[PDB]
Amino acid sequence: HGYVESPASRAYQCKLQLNTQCGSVQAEPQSVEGLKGFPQAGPADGHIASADKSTFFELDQQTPTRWNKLNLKTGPNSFTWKLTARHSTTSWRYFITKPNWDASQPLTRASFDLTPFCQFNDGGAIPAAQVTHQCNIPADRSGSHVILAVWDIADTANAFYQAIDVNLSK
Numbered sequence: 001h002g003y004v005e006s007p008a009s010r011a012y013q014c015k016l017q018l019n020t021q022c023g024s025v026q027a028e029p030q031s032v033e034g035l036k037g038f039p040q041a042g043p044a045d046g047h048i049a050s051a052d053k054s055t056f057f058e059l060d061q062q063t064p065t066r067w068n069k070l071n072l073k074t075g076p077n078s079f080t081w082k083l084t085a086r087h088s089t090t091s092w093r094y095f096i097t098k099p100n101w102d103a104s105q106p107l108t109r110a111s112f113d114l115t116p117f118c119q120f121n122d123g124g125a126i127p128a129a130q131v132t133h134q135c136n137i138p139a140d141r142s143g144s145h146v147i148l149a150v151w152d153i154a155d156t157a158n159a160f161y162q163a164i165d166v167n168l169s170k
Contacts, residue, residue, distance in 0.1 A: 001030040002083030002160060003068075004149050007070045009162040010049065010059060019068050023058040025050075030084040031054055036152045036159035045108035049163040050147065059163065064104045064144065067165040074139045074168050079149060080132040081162075089122040090154040094135055099144045107163070110147060113138075124154045142168050 011029035014022035034051025043052035052055035118135035
């Protein structure tokens with residue numbers, strides 16, 4: 001159990017009062033948990049942001065101005081997870097929407113470049129309460145986008161999904 005606290009994920013902003021109308025998730029942004037194996041398996045299209053968790057379906061809403069977006073530059077960035085429960089870990093992966101993705105429709109695999117721009121494999125080790133990954137956001141991405149940070153658990157069938165709303169510039 002954990003969430004991306006910086007840049008504050010969609011789910012987490014829901015608790016800080018930076019995002020509203022989220023529902024249950026604002027009570028526990030660290031529990032956006034669903035099946036692992038994305039993108040081959042995992043959350044069904046249209047329910048990726050909520051990890052296909054019915055009680056978190058508010059997260060699946062998608063319109064050009066629905067979510068509060070953070071302003072970031074392409075290139076080097078730092079993503080920090082805050083874990084409320086530390087489990088044996090297989091990997092951490094970050095995906096970003098393709099250029100020209102439809103920001104007026106619910107997220108689907110067709111919305112994302114299915115190859116993560118970066119991946120960290122922990123060999124099953126249990127992570128510290130704070131985890132920070134540094135990756136380069138693709139330079140060909142500008143304007144409104146969604147970065148999906150996925151945490152795959154090694155000893156269970158699940159993963160945690162953290163959608164992050166962003167507005168990119170050079």
